[PDB]
C-alpha cells in the first residue's frame, strides 16, 4: 500500500565490491524517476549485510527483515548456504525469494515453493557445456574442479558421459594445478573444462600457459559466470582457445550508463587496482528490482495489495505472497542480463548465454546457447 518495500541481503564487501549496493540504488532511482498518471507508490530497497556464509547469522537477518513488511527478499548472490536458509524461511512466511546467486541445496520438490531465479540453473550450464563439446565432436575431456561441489553443479554433464581417460575424466585441486595438467597431458587429452571461481580459473590457466598447454591444440571451457571480468594478461595467445559464457546484453539502453557508474564507484574505493568490468551479480540485482516491481504492479491492478509486519515467532504469513508468485512467473522483462522469464518451477527460461572466446585483445562471440 504505502510503498513497495523489498529487502536485499548482500554478502558483498563495501571496498572493491561487486557493486551490488549501487546496482540496487540505480534500479530504484530509474524506476522512481519515471512519473506516471496515475502515480504509483515509491520503490524502496532495505539493505541487510551478511559478514559470513552462516546459516546462523542469516536466520537472525531474516528475523530483522520480517517485521519490516516487505514484498520480496533478494539475494544473497554468493553465499549458497545462506541462500537456502533465506529460501526456507521465505517459503514459510510466503514472501517470495528472488534468487540471484548459486544455491546448491536440492531443494526437495515437495516443500513450500516461494522462489524465482534469475541465475542459470545447474542443468542449463551442463547443457551449454555439453553443446559446446558436441560442437567439437565430443573430444576426450578432463574436468578440473576447485571443490567437490562441481559434481553437483555439473551433475547432468558428468552422468551423461562414460567416465574414463578416453571419454571424460574428473580431477580435483588439493593447491597447485601443475600436477593435474601434466597428468592430462600424459593422457594426450586436448579439451579441458575448468569449474572454479575467477581467481582459481586464472591460476589453472597461468600454470597451463607455463607448460605450453595454452597453444591451439588445447580447448578450455570455463563454467565461471564472471568470465568477462576475468582478465588473462600474458596468458592468451593468437593460437589460444579459451571459451566461456556471459549473460550481458550490451545493446540494453542502460548498459553503457550502468558500467560508467560501477566504474567510478570502483575508483573511489580501490584507486590501487584497475576496474575489471561489471560483475554478473550486480546486473542480476538490478534486473531483480525491475522483475519484482513489474509483478507487484500487475498484481495491484487486479487486487488491493497490503503488507503487514511478520515475525519469526509467529505462524502468520503474507496472504498476498501466493498471488505475487503467479505474477512473478508471468513476468517478461528485458534487462541487463538478457530476457527474464520463468517456467512453472521458477527457473529462468527463454534466455541466452553468449558464448565468448578470449583473444589477445578483447573477446569474440562465436555463437550462443538457447533454451527454446
Amino acid at each position: 500500500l504505502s510503498s513497495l518495500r523489498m529487502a536485499a541481503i548482500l554478502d558483498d564487501q563495501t571496498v572493491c565490491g561487486r557493486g551490488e549496493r549501487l546496482a540496487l540504488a540505480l534500479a530504484r532511482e530509474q524506476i522512481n524517476g519515471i512519473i506516471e498518471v496515475p502515480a504509483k507508490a515509491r520503490v524502496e530497497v532495505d539493505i541487510f549485510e551478511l559478514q559470513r556464509d552462516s546459516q546462523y547469522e542469516t536466520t537472525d537477518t531474516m528475523c530483522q527483515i520480517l517485521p519490516k513488511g516487505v514484498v520480496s527478499v533478494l539475494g544473497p548472490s554468493s553465499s549458497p548456504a545462506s541462500a537456502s536458509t533465506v529460501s526456507h524461511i521465505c517459503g514459510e512466511k510466503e514472501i517470495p525469494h528472488i534468487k540471484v546467486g548459486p544455491e546448491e541445496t536440492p531443494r526437495l520438490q515437495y516443500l513450500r515453493f516461494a522462489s524465482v531465479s534469475l541465475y542459470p540453473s545447474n542443468e542449463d550450464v551442463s547443457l551449454a557445456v555439453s553443446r559446446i563439446l558436441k560442437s567439437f565432436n565430443y573430444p576426450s575431456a578432463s574436468l578440473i574442479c576447485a571443490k567437490a561441489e562441481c559434481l553437483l553443479r555439473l551433475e547432468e554433464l558428468v552422468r551423461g558421459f562414460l567416465i574414463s581417460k578416453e571419454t571424460l575424466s574428473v580431477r580435483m585441486l588439493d593447491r597447485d594445478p601443475t600436477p593435474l595438467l601434466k597428468e592430462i597431458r600424459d593422457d594426450k587429452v586436448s579439451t579441458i573444462i575448468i569449474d572454479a571461481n575467477a581467481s582459481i580459473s586464472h591460476l589453472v590457466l597461468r600454470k597451463a600457459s607455463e607448460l605450453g598447454m595454452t597453444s591451439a591444440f588445447y580447448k578450455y571451457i570455463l563454467t565461471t559466470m564472471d568470465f568477462p571480468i576475468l582478465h588473462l594478461d600474458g596468458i592468451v595467445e593468437d593460437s589460444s582457445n579459451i571459451l566461456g559464457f556471459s549473460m550481458f546484453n550490451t545493446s540494453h539502453p542502460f548498459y553503457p550508463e550502468f558500467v560508467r557508474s560501477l566504474n567510478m564507484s570502483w575508483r573511489e574505493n580501490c584507486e590501487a587496482s584497475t576496474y575489471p568490468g561489471p560483475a554478473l551479480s550486480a546486473a542480476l540485482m538490478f534486473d531483480a528490482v525491475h522483475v519484482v516491481v513489474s509483478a507487484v504492479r500487475e498484481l495491484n491492478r487486479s487486487q488491493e495489495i497490503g503488507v503487514k509486519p511478520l515475525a519469526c515467532t509467529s505462524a502468520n504469513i503474507w496472504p498476498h505472497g501466493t498471488s505475487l508468485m503467479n505474477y512473478l512467473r508471468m513476468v517478461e522483462y528485458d534487462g541487463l542480463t538478457g530476457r527474464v522469464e520463468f517456467n512453472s518451477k521458477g527457473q529462468r527460461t527463454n534466455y541466452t548465454l553468449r558464448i565468448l572466446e578470449k583473444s589477445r585483445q578483447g573477446h569474440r562471440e562465436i555463437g550462443v546457447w538457447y533454451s527454446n
Binding site: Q55, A81, A148, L162, I163, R171, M172
Partner: protein, 372 residues
C-alpha cells in the same frame, strides 16, 4: 550428587512416538548411569526436542531453546538440512554438536564445534575401490539415489583417472521406488558389475525387482554401500548363484556387543537386528561421556542465541571429544582432529555364500583389504 545435561533433537516418525535414534539415545544414557566404572560420579540427564522431518527452520528454534535451557552437547537431528542448521548454531555459541548420520559437509564451511560418528564416505569409497580392484573389474556401473549427491562418491568418480576403469553413472528415479526401467537399461547394456549407493530399505526392494527380471544369476555381481547389508533377507537369492558383497561396521563377532544387540530386541528386511543408525547414536553418547570424565568441572550455561558469547567450557570440551577413544558397538572409534570426521575405522567384508551372508575378510584404511 552431580548431574550433567545433554540435549537431543529428533525427527518425528510415522512408525511411532519414538524413532530408532531417540530410543538408542535413551538406551545409552540409562546403561551409562547404571555402569559404575564409566562416569562414576556423574549422572547423565537430557532434554528432548522433536521437529518435523525436513523442517530446518524449526531445528534452529529448538536448538536455541536447548542452549537457552543449558546443555553440554546436542545430539541430532538426522536429516541433513536441519543438521546443518543446528551445526551452525552450535558453532556460534561454542557448544559441541554430535552427529550420527552422514550429511553433505560443504567445502567452504569452517564450523569446528562438531563431530560425526558416521564413517567418512570417502574412506568407504576407497574400500569399495579396493573391492573393485581385487575382483579385477574393468567396467562397473554406479547407481545412486537422487536423495544423496554424487559428491559422496567422488572418490569413485576420480578413479578412472588413475586406474584402467570405465565407469557408467545411473540415477535411481526420485519420483518412485520402481526401478525396472533402469534395470532394463543395464540388462540391455550387459552391465554385470554394479555398485548400489542407497539405503538397505531401498536395496531390498531393488533386488526383488532384479529377481523378477532374471538379473539375480551367476552373471551378476553386486556391491552395496549400506552397512546394514547383513540385516537383509537373502533367502530368495542364496541359491541363484548371484554374488553380493558389502561391508559391516557392527562388531557383532564381539560377544559383549552381541549381548547388547540382544537387549535391543526387547519389505525384505529381517527382524531382531539393531540398525547401524541406532548403534551409532548409542556409541555417540558413550564416546562423549569419555570426554566428560576428563573434564569433571564443566557446568552447562544458559546461552541465548544472537546475544551471548560462546560457552566458556566449550572449546576445551570439544577438544577432548575429538581426542576421545572408545571401543563401541561399531568397533574402535576415533576422530580426525583436522575435520572432526571419522575417517579411520574397521570394517568386516561380508558376501553372499550359499548358506547366507557371511564374513570373508576385513578392511581398514592403513593396511587395505584383507580377504580370508
Amino acid at each position: 550428587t552431580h548431574v550433567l545435561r545433554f540435549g537431543g533433537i529428533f525427527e518425528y516418525v510415522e512408525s511411532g512416538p519414538m524413532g530408532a535414534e531417540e530410543l538408542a539415545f535413551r538406551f545409552a544414557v540409562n546403561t551409562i548411569n547404571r555402569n559404575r566404572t564409566l562416569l562414576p560420579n556423574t549422572t547423565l540427564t537430557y532434554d528432548t526436542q522433536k521437529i518435523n522431518l525436513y523442517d530446518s527452520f524449526e531445528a534452529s528454534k529448538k536448538a536455541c531453546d536447548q542452549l537457552s535451557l543449558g546443555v553440554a552437547a546436542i545430539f541430532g537431528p538426522s536429516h541433513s538440512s536441519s543438521a546443518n542448521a543446528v551445526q551452525s548454531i552450535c558453532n556460534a555459541l561454542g557448544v559441541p554438536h554430535i552427529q550420527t548420520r552422514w550429511k553433505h559437509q560443504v567445502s567452504d564451511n569452517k564450523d569446528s564445534f562438531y563431530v560425526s560418528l558416521y564413517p567418512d564416505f570417502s574412506s568407504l569409497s576407497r574400500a569399495i575401490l579396493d573391492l573393485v580392484q581385487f575382483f579385477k573389474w574393468k567396467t562397473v556401473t554406479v547407481v545412486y539415489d537422487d536423495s544423496t549427491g554424487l559428491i559422496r562418491l567422488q572418490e569413485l568418480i576420480k578413479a578412472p583417472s588413475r586406474y584402467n576403469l570405465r565407469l557408467k553413472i545411473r540415477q535411481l528415479p526420485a519420483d518412485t521406488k520402481d526401478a525396472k526401467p533402469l534395470l532394463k537399461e543395464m540388462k540391455r547394456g550387459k552391465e554385470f558389475h554394479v555398485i548400489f549407493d542407497c539405503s538397505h530399505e531401498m536395496a531390498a526392494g531393488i533386488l526383488k525387482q532384479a529377481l523378477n527380471m532374471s538379473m539375480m544369476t551367476e552373471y551378476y555381481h553386486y556391491i552395496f554401500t549400506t552397512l546394514d547389508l547383513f540385516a537383509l533377507d537373502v533367502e530368495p537369492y542364496r541359491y541363484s548363484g548371484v554374488n553380493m558383497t558389502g561391508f559391516r561396521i557392527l562388531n557383532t563377532e564381539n560377544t559383549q556387543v552381541s549381548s547388547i544387540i540382544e537387549k535391543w530386541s526387547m519389505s525384505g528386511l529381517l527382524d531382531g537386528f539393531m540398525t547401524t543408525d541406532a548403534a551409532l547414536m548409542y556409541d555417540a553418547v558413550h564416546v562423549v561421556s569419555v570426554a566428560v570424565q576428563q573434564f569433571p568441572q564443566m557446568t552447562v550455561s544458559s546461552l541465548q542465541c544472537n546475544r551471548h558469547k560462546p560457552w566458556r567450557f566449550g572449546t576445551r570440551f570439544m577438544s577432548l571429544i575429538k581426542e576421545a577413544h572408545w571401543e563401541g558397538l561399531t568397533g574402535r572409534i576415533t576422530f580426525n582432529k583436522t575435520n572432526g570426521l571419522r575417517t579411520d575405522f574397521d570394517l568386516d567384508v561380508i558376501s553372499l555364500k550359499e548358506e547366507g551372508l557371511e564374513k570373508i575378510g576385513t578392511w581398514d584404511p592403513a593396511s587395505g583389504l584383507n580377504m580370508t
